[PDB]
């Protein structure tokens, strides 16, 4: 059922730095994840241009933002290309190793955490607001998996069942207890307006 993996050392160190470096501009996590989602949607679109059957598992290309005050969760769902088990495990499809170095080198020379996305590792900016991240993904080529990590150097992957998605990725952010501003409709609206207002795909902010 549950496999447990070690992050490579460079990723564990990055994560450790994201969780530990004093940095109040936490709101950028949302832009980085919406922008990962948009990238994932570009990919399935581009692929469906010459094989229209890949849109068989869902034709709308969109992004949903779902807050839940009770679970203390913010979920970013896209119907993008999804990941296979191999992608998930290879740093969620990322070049996280050479990226984390390129990035940590950009810090050294006067970059700040907000540029993380420039090096292909914007994903880990979720750990600015989340104590645990869960990623549920389904790629046409594979079944549905759950990836999960509360940092500490390891992640798990299991196959996921019960709420099939069809195609795409859900990043479920289990928020730190002082970061519940990001469950607020006004707050989420403002951030999207401010950081993602020209995204190629509809974004729908769910109501509670
Ligand atoms: C180390 C962080 O780098 C990441 C981590 C996750 C994503 C990602 C995210 C994110 N975040 C996402 N929502 N979907 C996908 S699909 C995909 C692929 N087909 O390979 C991804 N890589 C991906 C993108 C970059």
From Swiss-Prot:
Chain ranges passing through the membrane: none
Chain positions found as N6-acetyllysine: 43, 69
Gene Ontology biological process terms in this record: activation of innate immune response; cardiac muscle cell apoptotic process; cellular response to heat; cellular response to virus; chaperone-mediated autophagy; chaperone-mediated protein complex assembly; mitochondrial transport; neurofibrillary tangle assembly
Domains: entry comment: The TPR repeat-binding motif mediates interaction with TPR repeat-containing proteins like the co-chaperone STUB1.
Function: Molecular chaperone that promotes the maturation, structural maintenance and proper regulation of specific target proteins involved for instance in cell cycle control and signal transduction. Undergoes a functional cycle that is linked to its ATPase activity which is essential for its chaperone activity. This cycle probably induces conformational changes in the client proteins, thereby causing their activation. Interacts dynamically with various co-chaperones that modulate its substrate recognition, ATPase cycle and chaperone function.
Family membership noted in the UniProt record: Belongs to the heat shock protein 90 family.
Protein name: Heat shock protein HSP 90-alpha
Organism expressing this protein natively: Homo sapiens
Taxonomic lineage of the native organism: Eukaryota, Metazoa, Chordata, Craniata, Vertebrata
